[PDB]
Amino acid sequence: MPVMQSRIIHLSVEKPWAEVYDFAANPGNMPRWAAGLAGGLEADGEDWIAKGGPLGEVRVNFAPHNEFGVIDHVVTLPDGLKVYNALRVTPNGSGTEVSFTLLRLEGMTDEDFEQDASAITADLEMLKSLLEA
Amino acid sequence: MPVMQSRIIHLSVEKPWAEVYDFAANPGNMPRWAAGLAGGLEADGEDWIAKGGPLGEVRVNFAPHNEFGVIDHVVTLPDGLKVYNALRVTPNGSGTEVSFTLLRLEGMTDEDFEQDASAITADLEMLKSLLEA
């Protein structure tokens, strides 16, 4: 399972680091800013399930609660492939830097990667919007 | 790629066959009833892309508009697996039978398969409410 090209998508939020983590680390808030989950996220035996639509079935496993701003999760695709998403919140002066490490999956086109990245960016932008209102 | 286990999910809609197809075959109407797509579906190069969420990006290719009530679609997961969903609308008296052919992929569990069937059911139940109101 070889090292992949990556991009770290990130932006600044004008709220204290702890408060951004409190809101963002709660998986039940995830349908509010992660557009792929706008349909809903249900708790399912320690982990979480996203039900319906095109691919009817993804599972998400989150990192356990911590004091390092870490909200990493593994997404299990319907075909069984587990995709690791590093996601973290750190202090940026009085505010916060939110970052997502996007790994290029095998055989992906440049356009596939760019669509993925602009989608994650919009998800983080929506998180920023929510917190700053 | 061997023959897979299957389930045909189906229900009846008390609207003529032609107006159930005209609505359900409009991919711009899909966010209204397919939960995995609740966050939107954009036209892209004569295909559709749903972004983003956990999975970042998924492509959907539909069957061309036909006279058979066929609304088949192929879903391309971000790891590149192509998933064929047979979906068809047919006359049932003065109404309509709506059916979705669920194929069990290698590396699904019984609870994943069940949860998948469950989510398809609710998508069809939602298309039913929308059309009957």
Coordinates of N, CA and C in Angstrom, one line a residue, chain A residues 34-40 44 49-60 73 75 77-81 83 85 100 105-106 108-109 111-116 118-120 123, chain B residues 30 34-40 44 49-60 73 75 77-79 81 83 85 100 105-109 111-113 115-116 118-120 123:
Chain A
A34 N -20.7 18.8 6.5 CA -20.2 17.8 5.5 C -21.3 17.4 4.5
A35 N -21.3 18.0 3.3 CA -22.4 17.9 2.3 C -22.7 16.4 1.9
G36 N -21.7 15.6 1.9 CA -21.9 14.1 1.7 C -22.7 13.4 2.7
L37 N -22.9 14.1 3.9 CA -23.7 13.5 5.0 C -24.9 14.3 5.3
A38 N -25.2 15.3 4.4 CA -26.4 16.1 4.6 C -27.7 15.2 4.7
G39 N -27.7 14.0 4.2 CA -28.7 13.0 4.4 C -28.9 12.5 5.8
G40 N -27.8 12.5 6.6 CA -27.8 12.1 8.0 C -26.7 11.2 8.4
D44 N -24.0 3.7 15.4 CA -24.1 2.3 15.0 C -22.9 1.4 15.6
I49 N -22.8 5.4 10.7 CA -23.2 4.9 9.3 C -24.0 6.0 8.6
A50 N -23.6 6.2 7.3 CA -24.3 7.1 6.4 C -25.1 6.4 5.4
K51 N -26.5 6.5 5.6 CA -27.4 5.7 4.8 C -28.0 6.4 3.6
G52 N -27.9 5.7 2.4 CA -28.8 6.0 1.3 C -28.2 6.5 0.0
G53 N -29.0 6.5 -1.0 CA -28.8 7.2 -2.3 C -28.1 6.4 -3.4
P54 N -27.0 7.0 -3.9 CA -26.3 6.3 -5.0 C -25.6 5.0 -4.5
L55 N -24.6 5.2 -3.8 CA -24.0 4.1 -3.0 C -24.7 4.2 -1.6
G56 N -25.5 3.2 -1.3 CA -26.4 3.2 -0.2 C -25.7 3.2 1.2
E57 N -24.3 3.0 1.2 CA -23.6 2.5 2.4 C -22.2 2.9 2.6
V58 N -21.9 3.9 3.4 CA -20.6 4.1 4.0 C -20.6 4.2 5.5
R59 N -19.5 3.6 6.1 CA -19.3 3.6 7.5 C -18.2 4.6 7.9
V60 N -18.3 5.3 9.0 CA -17.2 6.2 9.4 C -16.8 5.9 10.8
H73 N -10.6 10.4 10.9 CA -11.6 9.3 10.7 C -11.3 8.4 9.5
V75 N -13.0 6.2 6.6 CA -14.3 5.9 5.9 C -14.2 4.5 5.2
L77 N -15.6 2.3 2.4 CA -16.4 2.3 1.2 C -17.2 1.1 1.1
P78 N -18.3 1.1 0.4 CA -19.2 0.0 0.2 C -18.5 -1.3 -0.3
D79 N -17.4 -1.1 -1.0 CA -16.6 -2.2 -1.5 C -15.6 -2.8 -0.5
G80 N -15.5 -2.1 0.6 CA -14.6 -2.6 1.7 C -13.3 -1.8 1.9
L81 N -13.0 -1.0 1.0 CA -11.8 -0.1 1.1 C -11.9 0.9 2.2
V83 N -10.5 4.2 3.9 CA -9.8 5.5 3.5 C -9.6 6.3 4.8
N85 N -8.6 9.7 6.7 CA -8.6 11.1 6.5 C -8.1 11.8 7.8
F100 N -7.2 19.3 6.6 CA -7.7 18.0 6.1 C -6.6 17.5 5.2
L105 N -6.1 8.8 -4.2 CA -6.3 7.3 -4.4 C -5.7 6.9 -5.7
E106 N -5.3 5.6 -5.7 CA -4.7 4.9 -6.9 C -5.5 5.1 -8.1
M108 N -6.4 7.7 -9.8 CA -7.2 8.9 -9.9 C -6.7 9.9 -11.0
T109 N -7.6 10.5 -11.7 CA -7.2 11.6 -12.6 C -6.9 12.9 -11.8
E111 N -8.3 15.7 -12.5 CA -9.7 16.2 -12.3 C -10.4 15.6 -11.1
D112 N -10.2 14.3 -10.9 CA -10.8 13.6 -9.8 C -10.3 14.1 -8.5
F113 N -9.0 14.3 -8.4 CA -8.4 14.9 -7.2 C -8.8 16.3 -7.0
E114 N -9.0 17.1 -8.0 CA -9.3 18.5 -7.9 C -10.8 18.7 -7.4
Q115 N -11.6 17.8 -7.9 CA -13.0 17.8 -7.5 C -13.2 17.5 -6.0
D116 N -12.5 16.4 -5.6 CA -12.4 16.0 -4.2 C -11.9 17.2 -3.4
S118 N -11.9 20.5 -4.0 CA -12.8 21.6 -3.9 C -14.1 21.3 -3.1
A119 N -14.5 20.0 -3.1 CA -15.5 19.6 -2.2 C -15.2 19.6 -0.7
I120 N -14.0 19.2 -0.3 CA -13.5 19.3 1.1 C -13.4 20.7 1.5
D123 N -16.7 22.0 2.3 CA -17.1 21.5 3.6 C -16.5 22.2 4.8
Chain B
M30 N -33.1 14.3 -8.2 CA -32.6 13.3 -7.3 C -32.3 13.7 -5.8
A34 N -33.2 11.0 -3.1 CA -32.1 10.1 -2.8 C -31.2 10.7 -1.7
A35 N -31.2 10.1 -0.5 CA -30.6 10.7 0.7 C -29.1 10.9 0.6
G36 N -28.4 10.0 0.0 CA -27.0 10.1 -0.3 C -26.7 11.3 -1.1
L37 N -27.7 11.9 -1.8 CA -27.5 13.0 -2.7 C -28.2 14.3 -2.2
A38 N -28.8 14.2 -1.0 CA -29.4 15.4 -0.3 C -28.6 16.7 -0.5
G39 N -27.3 16.6 -0.4 CA -26.5 17.7 -0.5 C -26.2 18.3 -1.9
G40 N -26.9 17.7 -2.9 CA -26.8 18.1 -4.3 C -26.1 17.2 -5.3
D44 N -21.9 17.5 -15.0 CA -20.5 17.6 -15.3 C -20.1 16.7 -16.5
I49 N -21.8 14.6 -10.9 CA -20.9 14.4 -9.7 C -21.7 14.8 -8.5
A50 N -21.6 14.0 -7.5 CA -22.0 14.4 -6.1 C -20.8 14.6 -5.3
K51 N -20.6 15.8 -4.7 CA -19.6 16.2 -3.8 C -20.2 16.7 -2.5
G52 N -19.6 16.5 -1.3 CA -18.3 15.9 -1.2 C -18.4 15.0 0.1
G53 N -18.2 15.5 1.2 CA -18.5 14.9 2.5 C -17.4 14.0 3.0
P54 N -17.8 12.7 3.3 CA -16.8 11.7 3.7 C -15.9 11.3 2.5
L55 N -16.6 10.9 1.4 CA -16.1 10.4 0.2 C -15.5 11.4 -0.8
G56 N -15.6 12.7 -0.5 CA -15.2 13.7 -1.4 C -16.0 13.9 -2.7
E57 N -16.0 12.8 -3.5 CA -16.5 12.9 -4.8 C -16.9 11.5 -5.4
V58 N -18.1 11.5 -6.0 CA -18.6 10.3 -6.6 C -19.3 10.7 -8.0
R59 N -19.1 9.9 -9.0 CA -19.7 10.2 -10.3 C -20.9 9.3 -10.6
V60 N -21.9 9.8 -11.2 CA -23.0 9.1 -11.6 C -23.3 9.2 -13.1
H73 N -28.4 3.5 -13.3 CA -27.3 4.3 -13.2 C -26.0 3.6 -12.7
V75 N -22.6 4.0 -10.6 CA -21.9 4.9 -9.7 C -20.4 4.5 -9.6
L77 N -17.3 5.0 -7.4 CA -16.7 5.3 -6.1 C -15.3 6.0 -6.4
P78 N -14.8 6.8 -5.4 CA -13.6 7.5 -5.5 C -12.3 6.7 -5.6
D79 N -12.5 5.4 -5.3 CA -11.4 4.4 -5.6 C -11.6 3.8 -7.0
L81 N -14.2 2.0 -8.3 CA -15.1 0.9 -8.6 C -16.4 1.4 -9.2
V83 N -20.3 0.7 -10.0 CA -21.4 0.0 -9.3 C -22.7 0.3 -10.1
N85 N -26.6 0.1 -10.8 CA -27.9 0.0 -10.1 C -29.0 0.0 -11.1
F100 N -35.7 -1.3 -7.6 CA -34.3 -1.1 -7.6 C -33.6 -2.4 -7.3
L105 N -22.0 -6.5 -3.1 CA -20.6 -6.4 -3.4 C -19.7 -7.3 -2.5
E106 N -18.6 -7.8 -3.1 CA -17.6 -8.5 -2.3 C -17.1 -7.6 -1.2
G107 N -17.2 -8.0 0.1 CA -16.8 -7.2 1.2 C -17.8 -6.3 1.8
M108 N -19.1 -6.7 1.6 CA -20.2 -6.2 2.4 C -20.5 -7.3 3.5
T109 N -21.0 -6.8 4.7 CA -21.4 -7.7 5.7 C -23.0 -7.7 5.7
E111 N -25.1 -6.9 7.8 CA -25.7 -5.7 8.4 C -25.5 -4.5 7.4
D112 N -24.4 -4.6 6.6 CA -24.2 -3.5 5.6 C -25.2 -3.7 4.5
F113 N -25.4 -5.0 4.0 CA -26.4 -5.3 3.0 C -27.8 -4.9 3.5
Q115 N -28.7 -2.7 5.9 CA -28.7 -1.2 6.0 C -28.8 -0.5 4.6
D116 N -28.2 -1.1 3.6 CA -28.3 -0.7 2.3 C -29.7 -0.8 1.7
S118 N -32.3 -1.1 3.5 CA -33.2 -0.2 4.3 C -33.1 1.3 3.8
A119 N -32.0 1.7 3.3 CA -31.8 3.1 2.9 C -32.4 3.2 1.5
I120 N -32.4 2.2 0.7 CA -33.0 2.2 -0.6 C -34.5 2.3 -0.5
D123 N -35.6 5.8 0.3 CA -35.5 6.7 -0.8 C -36.7 6.5 -1.7

